[PDB]
Design an enzyme around this catalytic site. Structure first.
Site, mmCIF file in Angstrom:
data_model
loop_
_atom_site.group_PDB
_atom_site.id
_atom_site.type_symbol
_atom_site.label_atom_id
_atom_site.label_comp_id
_atom_site.label_asym_id
_atom_site.label_seq_id
_atom_site.Cartn_x
_atom_site.Cartn_y
_atom_site.Cartn_z
ATOM 1 N N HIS A 1 5.604 30.711 -24.433
ATOM 2 C CA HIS A 1 6.734 29.791 -24.412
ATOM 3 C C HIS A 1 6.550 28.653 -23.416
ATOM 4 C CE1 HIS A 1 8.098 31.564 -20.620
ATOM 5 N NE2 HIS A 1 7.938 32.754 -21.170
ATOM 6 N N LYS B 1 5.919 38.620 34.994
ATOM 7 C CA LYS B 1 7.130 38.970 35.721
ATOM 8 C C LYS B 1 7.601 40.375 35.379
ATOM 9 C CE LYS B 1 9.723 35.318 34.626
ATOM 10 N NZ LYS B 1 8.869 34.321 33.949
ATOM 11 N N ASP C 1 16.140 39.247 27.968
ATOM 12 C CA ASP C 1 15.501 38.045 28.492
ATOM 13 C C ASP C 1 15.719 36.915 27.494
ATOM 14 O OD1 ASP C 1 13.377 36.790 30.469
ATOM 15 O OD2 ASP C 1 12.668 36.343 28.441
ATOM 16 N N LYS D 1 18.267 38.881 32.483
ATOM 17 C CA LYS D 1 17.910 37.622 33.119
ATOM 18 C C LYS D 1 19.138 36.735 33.237
ATOM 19 C CE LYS D 1 15.377 34.603 30.797
ATOM 20 N NZ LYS D 1 14.117 34.067 30.222
ATOM 21 N N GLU E 1 16.185 31.391 38.516
ATOM 22 C CA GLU E 1 16.002 32.513 37.607
ATOM 23 C C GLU E 1 15.905 33.811 38.391
ATOM 24 O OE1 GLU E 1 12.446 32.239 35.331
ATOM 25 O OE2 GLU E 1 12.890 33.971 34.062
#
Ligand SMILES: [Zn+2]
Ligand SMILES: [Zn+2]
Lengths: 49, 49, 49, 196, 16, 147, 147, 1013, 28
Positions: H142, H555, H666, H699, H737
């Site tokens: 088709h 960290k 965080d 954080k 921070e």
């Protein structure tokens, strides 16, 4: 499918679908499956046949 | 108009043979028949009609 | 926008329209409850007089 | 089409607003007849003027574009010297608080009728604006034609890798004689020396 | 059948 | 007159020799006749009209616009003539960018232009060479500038 | 003629060295000037940047006006529509980037048959079918269209 | 089934079965939707057989804005009709093009040696006096049309909602093994519209599934062949039809070949070759088909090899570049053609590294697994933005092109292959011909015969692309024994997969912490804390060499080691791409963890591709199973305000256990409301997720504390037993921070009020209040450490490729950057001179102060002046760190704060004009501001320290400086850089104090993404 | 002590192709 006018609602989903014969049949089967009365079932089983 | 004249003459003479040749094919592919009917000389008349 | 005559046939026609639309609205209700998941209900135009 | 919808956009107050606009336009058509459609014709512009200011609310620090506003103001002040009704028709369309009603009005300019055209004035104005004498700078048209030629040649070369000009007719000191014989395109610095 | 049912022609005041 | 009846009644127009004569010597003064008929559903009293060209002029304009549409229009982005609904939507989305973003780091500014009788103020001296280029690229120089 | 106008627009835009999107079908043309900037330190600098944006926009529009005047075409500057959060092309509004369809114009054509068409079982229903499909195409959640 | 019913109804109607007509509709094939918050039952009985639709912000408040996501409208096919132009006519096709297109079906569902194809040619011979072809197999029936083009399906819905969804078509892989007849476009559009109507008033995130319900309407495609037994010979009508008729000569006939027995690597090579050559041909044509999805379908991600595919793509791009140089350069003045080939290849690669449909192919799969074999940098973002993926593509092709510039290159497979998607003369001709152009151009120099052959080849290309034939002379140029594959591109690499380990991860580096406690008692004390300044400087961010997605894992490791924190499992929410999660995973190998991150989608286009997993989990290799939600995190909520996210977390904990002993929050929040909502959420869910002896690490910033009254300390402090605020040695230089560490959960709360008075004596011990010198000292103390320890070379960019690409970004050429980078390894003992040389060449290639042209030069621009200041300050940081230039460090900080001075002028001298800039004059101000560009400023320091590797450096020597500069230009040296560019004026601390900057503007287009499959 | 170096309109336009001189291959 044996009609004159009055297109089905399945044409509101795809704009330019190739096969309308399957559009209408899928629509009427959907109705017959999700219906809540016999007058709709006996009618959806007639428009497709 | 010799163009439309020749086209309608071919129609009147070469329509019932092409119909049989198209219906003679065993696996029916309708879209192929449509494009063949449209990709030949008869298509000159259909577009007019 | 005049109101200096008898609008009887208008009320008749609109009432009949609402009555015969509430009948056929079941197809739309069924399709939308199945396809979607949001049942609806018919509202007559006469709710806002 | 604007009563008791599953999407509760339009209330009855909005329909009252629309019917009041219809009534204002109908009063204008009642005082002035076929000469009223010079004023109703200002329905679609005003609607647009109402959309921009609505679109401008979310980002309002942009400076205004007062040309269209002043044009609509001037045209309304002039038409008011004929029929005061439009001064209301302009004040009620600005009172709409939603966009859907503004669209319903924008698609309703034809809902006040049509006039009997005076084809005499139309034919006269056609003959006038057609036979106007013009001052034209032909060099600009030459430039646009050169731009069209450049575009066509660049496309057809990108596609077919061939120039559709003749190198035999072309002079021998022409900068586009080598690029034509051997299929090539000039450098962008080489084309600026062949402007227009 | 050989007639119009909706506005599909200009409106002129020369026949009335 | 109607187009189909005239076609079935008149000769078949050889497009090659037709364009050849159009290019070399134009048309005669018998085929240069244009009628007019007012427009419907217009809110103007002056009146805008139709354009009933003659058979030769109709065929000329139609085939030339077909050539322009088939060949030159695709080169330019903006001519929404060969496009379809989805392409128009794509273009209007591209152009509408920088709108409704609650930020000034990306701003579009549209300019809807109103031309005072764009269709009447056209002159041969303003579109002569631009059409001669088209005629060159079609093999019929001095074909389209003859409008 | 649209090709001619687009050539004018391209030339003047390249001369101004300005980026522009273009939509055109003839007399109705939208020339969208696009700009982008950085994060501002205050509102004064932002407003000044917007002033310079509109200045550059009117500069390019003046250039296009002069071009069309050299070609013998006028541009009514008192009717030009300018906006940074709205667009309009083909009687189709675009509000804050979102395309919107005029639903009422479509329902107003219910039972209104076309030229040489009798009210009929097949013809009168097309008047609602086509318009409902058109309403659904330019609208989200096509539920109202069905009802 | 509706499809079977339609089939049998057509059978009853026409008396015999039909084909290529019936198409199943998605209304029963897919059915209603199955939302993901519900358990979604059919996701257990089966696998990837569905369509997913995600909505990160619901369907609420439509028409108020555009929306962030692109819109899938439908099929690329045109309709030939538009309601917007009813006056226009239906676009038809001439009979000659409708009849000559039937040859497309000459070996697709017919046979050449048959009575039907003979009639097909008899028709053409009839209507035209003009008196066997290629092969087609593996396509639907088709999808065949001459009078028009098969549509497939278009949208019936506005864009306001489509701009708020993203659908996935790569979730139907299990159905990709077969070639079913259904349509992807219609299914995706059904999914979109149903997800919009079913979730209209939803304001939070959503994810919906559409699984195959009616399996009967799958209808696998078969290989059918038509034929007749009759003769139809239409009479000639050419002599009676020339009137309206106004006015295919040669065609190569490739042979078939054994494609099955070919190994998978060669198949990948061949498909890559075809794709690359076609992309190059289209890009040199400047067409829109180059940005289509068919060139790079997503249906071959997991069914293709990486090395072979990419090598084939490289070979194809090179061959295409060879077939363009003849049409661009002039053979007379041409020399070193390999340089031109390499330039065209670089052009094609840089144009391909910004292509959406290509980067989606390489976003996740074996191709990306191969791209990451090369050393590189981990992407910093959640699902890789197109630029972060283009960086990887450029790095890989730059590693693969380093052998090309050596002069030794050759195709791995001398034989060629073709497919039906690239089956045309305009592709076959140049593709067959490139084999000669490669040998003729890649070699060093040319000869007369080579020039004659190249001229003949240019003429031959013109004749081939222009549909004109060729004489019997060009035969020596064509490629002999070129084969063909019947299947298409996305149905040819139907092979399997074959054969994980864990790379060597040693003890990564750590640092010491600085802790201040907070005690809770009923006595409400006053909240008296001086607010710290919001200062930013990337110095320590540049020192940290181990650039996993960010330098944060330093960290978290420091805190874990410096407070006695152990954990069986953990929950990490807020990370970007699994950096901290991967750190916690690799620090405890016997540890599973939960990952949560917000799904960014603005700078990430997806042509139906699902969001990849986080990139940092590549650090583990094949050990990704420990992250329980690494491959399912995108179908679920992610916002830390929505309680549904924490419900999902509890559901994970219940269904898998994990005895969670740690939670790490965080993230960088931008408004106080979001932080307050997150805190109220973690208040009501920590008791159910965390154990009594558990740990929390939240954080935050001292600025948000001193500003806001209600914060995490007033909320999460009391409910825990012990609580502290800690800063780290591997923390940014001057910042507020602080990590709020909280150990132990209290049963009942009797101590809701903190004691701020016992914080004032230690709130000044933060780094933000300390001066710049006390942080420069800590920067030096940290730079001495071996931060790159225990990290394999697989996850580090090479220093000499890194500096090469960095210079290549900053206006510098390719080969010049190559040589300048090799010169760093030639003698790293004197690298100050080389860094100043880098600055010199950068300022030279951005602002040339030597070239004397006739026209007065235009003034600088943004990007050309921004890179100058970026490079200057980024290298001045390193110079100060290496030579104790504290005043220069303070100057760098100040210019980061106010602006970077640039003052431009144009002087007139013999020749006429030359530009000249400085940093003190009243010339034209191009003073640029650099505050959102600290990442490059840190990347410079990182690259230079990666080069150094703790090696001692010699002093600065002007002799070697001028020696290096003369390799670029004779007039370039330390003298000319003192009176004409102001770089020595910068280094020697003489600049303009008055910030003469302004907000930058530009008339650049807006990139609105959308497509049509 | 000291280092080893010591002295003794408002809107930008829209436009601001190939490269063959910036590269040089080698052989043998
Ligand atoms: Zn089924
Ligand atoms: Zn599911």
């Amino acid at each position: 499918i044996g009609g004159v006018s009055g297109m089905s609602l399945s044409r509101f989903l795809i704009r330019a679908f190739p096969d309308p014969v399957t559009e209408s049949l899928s629509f009427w089967r959907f109705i017959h499956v999700h219906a809540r009365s016999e007058h709709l079932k006996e009618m959806s089983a007639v428009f497709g046949n | 108009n010799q163009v439309i004249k020749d086209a309608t003459i071919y129609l009147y003479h070469e329509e019932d043979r092409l119909r049989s040749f198209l219906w003679s094919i065993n696996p029916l592919f309708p879209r192929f028949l449509s494009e063949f009917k449209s990709g030949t000389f008869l298509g000159v008349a259909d577009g007019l009609i | 926008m005049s109101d200096n005559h008898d609008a009887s046939q208008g009320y008749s026609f609109l009432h009949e329209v609402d009555k015969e639309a509430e009948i056929t609205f079941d197809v739309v209700e069924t399709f939308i409850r199945g396809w979607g998941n949001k049942p609806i209900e018919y509202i007559k135009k006469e709710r806002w007089t | 089409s604007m009563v008791c919808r599953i999407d509760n956009l339009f209330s009855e107050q909005d329909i009252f607003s629309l019917l009041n606009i219809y009534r204002i336009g109908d009063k204008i058509v009642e005082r002035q007849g076929n000469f009223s459609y010079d004023l109703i014709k200002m329905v679609e512009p005003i609607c647009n003027l109402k959309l921009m200011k609505l679109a401008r609310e979310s980002r309002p620090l942009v400076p205004q574009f007062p040309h269209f506003e002043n044009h609509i103001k001037t045209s309304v002040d002039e038409g008011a010297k004929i029929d005061r009704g439009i001064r209301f028709l302009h004040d009620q369309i600005m009172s709409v608080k939603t966009v859907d009603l503004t669209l319903v009005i924008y698609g309703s300019f034809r809902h006040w009728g049509h006039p009997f055209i005076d084809y005499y004035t139309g034919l006269e104005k056609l003959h006038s604006q057609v036979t106007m004498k013009k001052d034209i700078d032909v060099s600009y048209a030459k430039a646009l034609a050169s731009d069209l030629a450049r575009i066509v040649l660049f496309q057809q070369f990108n596609d077919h890798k061939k120039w559709f000009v003749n190198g035999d007719l072309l002079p021998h000191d022409h900068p586009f004689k080598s690029h034509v014989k051997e299929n090539t395109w000039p450098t962008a610095a080489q084309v600026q020396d062949f402007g227009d | 059948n050989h007639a119009d049912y909706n506005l599909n022609s200009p409106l002129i005041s020369d026949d009335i | 007159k109607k187009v189909l009846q005239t076609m079935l009644d008149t000769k078949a127009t050889n497009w090659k020799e037709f364009l050849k004569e159009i290019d070399e010597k134009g048309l005669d003064d018998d085929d240069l006749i244009i009628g007019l008929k007012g427009k419907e559903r217009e809110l103007k009293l002056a009146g805008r009209f139709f354009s009933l060209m003659s058979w030769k002029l109709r065929e000329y304009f139609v085939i030339t616009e077909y050539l322009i549409k088939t060949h030159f229009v695709p080169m330019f982005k903006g001519l929404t003539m060969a496009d379809d609904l989805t392409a128009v939507i794509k273009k209007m989305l591209d152009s509408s960018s920088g709108q409704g973003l609650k930020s000034y780091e990306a701003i579009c500014i549209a300019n809807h232009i109103d031309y005072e009788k764009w269709n009447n103020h056209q002159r041969k001296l303003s579109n002569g060479p631009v059409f001669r280029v088209m005629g060159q690229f079609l093999g019929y120089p001095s074909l389209i500038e003859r409008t | 003629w649209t090709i001619l106008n687009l050539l004018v627009i391209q030339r003047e835009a390249k001369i101004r060295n300005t980026a522009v999107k273009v939509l055109a079908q003839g007399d109705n043309q939208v020339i969208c000037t696009q700009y982008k900037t950085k994060k501002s330190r205050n509102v004064v600098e932002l407003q000044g940047a917007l002033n310079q944006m509109v200045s550059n926009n009117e500069k390019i529009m003046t250039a296009i006006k002069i071009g069309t005047g050299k070609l013998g075409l006028l541009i009514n500057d008192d009717e030009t529509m300018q906006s940074a959060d709205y667009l309009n092309y083909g009687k189709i509004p675009i509000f804050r980037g979102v395309i919107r369809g005029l639903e009422t114009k479509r329902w107003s054509r219910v039972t209104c048959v076309t030229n040489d068409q009798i009210p009929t079982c097949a013809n009168i229903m097309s008047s609602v079918s086509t318009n409902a499909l058109t309403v659904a195409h330019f609208a989200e959640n096509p539920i109202n269209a069905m009802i | 089934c509706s499809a079977t019913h339609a089939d049998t109804l057509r059978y009853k109607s026409w008396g015999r079965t039909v084909i290529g007509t019936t198409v199943p509709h998605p209304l029963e094939m897919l059915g209603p939707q199955h939302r993901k918050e519900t358990p979604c039952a059919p996701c257990n009985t089966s696998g990837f057989n569905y369509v997913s639709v995600h909505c990160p912000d619901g369907i609420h408040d439509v028409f108020s804005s555009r929306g962030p996501l692109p819109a899938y409208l439908g099929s690329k096919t045109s309709e030939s009709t538009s309601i917007l132009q009813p006056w226009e006519r239906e676009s038809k096709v001439p009979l000659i093009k409708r009849a000559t297109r039937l040859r497309d079906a000459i070996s697709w569902f017919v046979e050449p040696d048959s009575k039907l194809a003979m009639t097909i040619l008899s028709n053409i011979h009839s209507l035209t006096g003009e008196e066997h072809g290629f092969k087609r197999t593996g396509s639907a029936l088709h999808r065949f049309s001459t009078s028009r083009m098969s549509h497939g399906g278009f949208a019936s819905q506005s864009t306001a909602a489509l701009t708020r969804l993203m659908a996935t078509t790569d979730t139907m892989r299990d159905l990709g093994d077969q070639n079913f007849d259904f349509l992807f476009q219609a299914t995706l559009l059904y999914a979109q519209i149903t997800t919009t109507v079913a979730r209209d008033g939803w304001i939070t995130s959503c994810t919906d599934h559409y699984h195959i319900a009616c399996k009967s309407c799958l209808r696998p495609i078969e290989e059918i062949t038509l034929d007749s037994s009759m003769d139809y010979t239409p009479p000639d009508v050419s002599h009676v039809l020339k009137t309206w008729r106004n006015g295919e000569i040669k065609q190569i006939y490739p042979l078939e070949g054994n494609w099955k027995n070919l190994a998978p690597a060669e198949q990948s090579y061949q498909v890559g070759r075809c794709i690359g050559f076609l992309y190059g041909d289209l890009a040199y044509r400047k067409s829109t088909h180059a940005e289509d999805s068919s060139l790079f379908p997503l249906s071959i991600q997991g069914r293709i090899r990486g090395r072979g595919f990419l090598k084939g793509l490289l070979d194809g791009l090179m061959r295409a570049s060879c077939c363009q140089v003849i049409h661009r350069r002039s053979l007379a003045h041409l020399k070193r053609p390999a340089n031109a080939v390499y330039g065209g290849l670089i052009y094609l690669i840089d144009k391909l590294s910004v292509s959406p449909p290509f980067l989606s192919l390489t976003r996740s799969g074996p191709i990306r697994d191969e791209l990451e074999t090369i050393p590189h940098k981990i992407p910093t973002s959640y699902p890789t933005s197109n630029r972060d993926m283009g960086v990887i593509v450029r790095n890989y092709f730059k590693y693969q092109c380093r052998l090309i510039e050596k002069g030794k290159y050759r195709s791995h497979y001398s034989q060629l292959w073709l497919f039906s998607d690239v089956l045309s003369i305009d592709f076959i001709g140049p593709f067959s011909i490139s084999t000669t152009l490669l040998q003729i151009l890649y070699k060093p120099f040319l000869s007369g015969k080579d020039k004659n052959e190249l001229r003949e080849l240019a003429n031959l290309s013109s004749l081939l692309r222009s549909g004109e034939g060729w004489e019997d002379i060009h035969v020596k140029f064509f490629t002999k024994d070129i084969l063909l594959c019947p299947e298409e591109i996305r149905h040819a690499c139907k092979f399997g997969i074959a054969k994980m380990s864990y790379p060597p991860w040693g003890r990564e580096s750590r640092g010491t912490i600085t802790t201040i406690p907070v005690y809770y008692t009923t006595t409400p004390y006053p909240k008296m804390l001086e607010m710290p300044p919001r200062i930013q400087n990337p110095l320590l961010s540049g020192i940290r060499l181990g650039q996993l997605p960010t330098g944060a894992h330093y960290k978290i490791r420091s805190i874990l080691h410096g407070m006695g924190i152990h954990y069986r499992d953990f929950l990490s929410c807020g990370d970007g791409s699994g950096g901290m999660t991967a750190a916690l995973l690799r620090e405890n190998v016997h540890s599973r963890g939960i990952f949560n991150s917000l799904l960014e989608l603005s700078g990430s286009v997806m042509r139906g591709a699902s969001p990849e997993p986080p990139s940092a989990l590549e650090t583990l290799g094949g050990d990704k199973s420990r992250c329980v939600n690494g491959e399912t995190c995108w179908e679920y909520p992610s916002d830390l305000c929505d309680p549904r996210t924490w419900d999902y977390f509890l559901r994970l904990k219940a269904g898998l256990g994990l005895q969670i002993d740690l939670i790490v929050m965080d993230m960088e929040v931008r408004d106080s409301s979001t932080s307050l909502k997150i805190e109220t959420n973690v208040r009501n869910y920590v008791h159910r997720i965390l154990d009594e002896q558990g740990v929390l690490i939240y954080k935050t910033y001292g600025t948000y504390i001193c500003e806001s009254e209600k914060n995490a300390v007033t909320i999460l402090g009391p409910m825990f037993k012990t609580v502290d605020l800690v800063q780290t040695e591997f923390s940014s230089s001057q910042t507020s921070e602080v990590y709020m560490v909280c150990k132990g959960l209290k049963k009942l709360i009797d101590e809701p009020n903190p004691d701020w008075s016992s914080i004032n004596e230690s709130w000044k011990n933060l780094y933000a209040f300390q001066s710049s010198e006390q942080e420069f000292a800590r920067a030096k103390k940290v730079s001495t450490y071996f931060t790159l320890t225990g990290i394999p070379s697989q996850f580090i960019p090479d220093p000499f490729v890194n500096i090469e690409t960095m210079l290549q970004i900053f206006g510098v050429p390719t080969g010049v950057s190559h040589a300048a980078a090799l010169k760093s390894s030639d003698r790293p003992a004197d690298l100050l001179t080389i860094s100043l040389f880098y600055m010199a060449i950068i300022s030279y290639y951005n602002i040339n102060h030597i070239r004397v042209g006739p026209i007065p030069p235009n003034p600088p621009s943004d990007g050309i002046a921004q890179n100058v200041g970026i490079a200057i300050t980024g290298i001045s940081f390193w110079l100060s760190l290496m030579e104790k230039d504290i005043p220069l460090y303070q100057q760098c900080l100040a210019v980061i704060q106010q602006s970077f001075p640039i003052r431009w002028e144009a002087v007139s001298v013999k020749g006429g004009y030359k530009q000249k800039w400085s940093t003190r004059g009243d010339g034209l101000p191009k003073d640029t501001r650099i505050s959102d560009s600290l990442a490059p400023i840190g990347n410079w320091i990182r690259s230079l320290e990666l080069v150094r590797n703790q090696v001692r450096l010699n002093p600065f020597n002007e002799i070697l400086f001028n020696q290096l500069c003369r390799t670029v230009d004779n007039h370039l040296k330390w003298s000319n850089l003192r009176r004409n560019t102001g770089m020595i004026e910068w280094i020697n601390r003489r600049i303009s104090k008055e910030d003469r900057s302004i907000l930058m503007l530009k008339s650049d287009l807006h990139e609105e993404n959308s497509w049509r499959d | 002590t000291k280092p080893s170096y010591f002295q003794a309109e408002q809107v930008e336009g829209f436009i601001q192709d190939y490269a063959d001189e910036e590269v040089d291959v080698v052989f043998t």
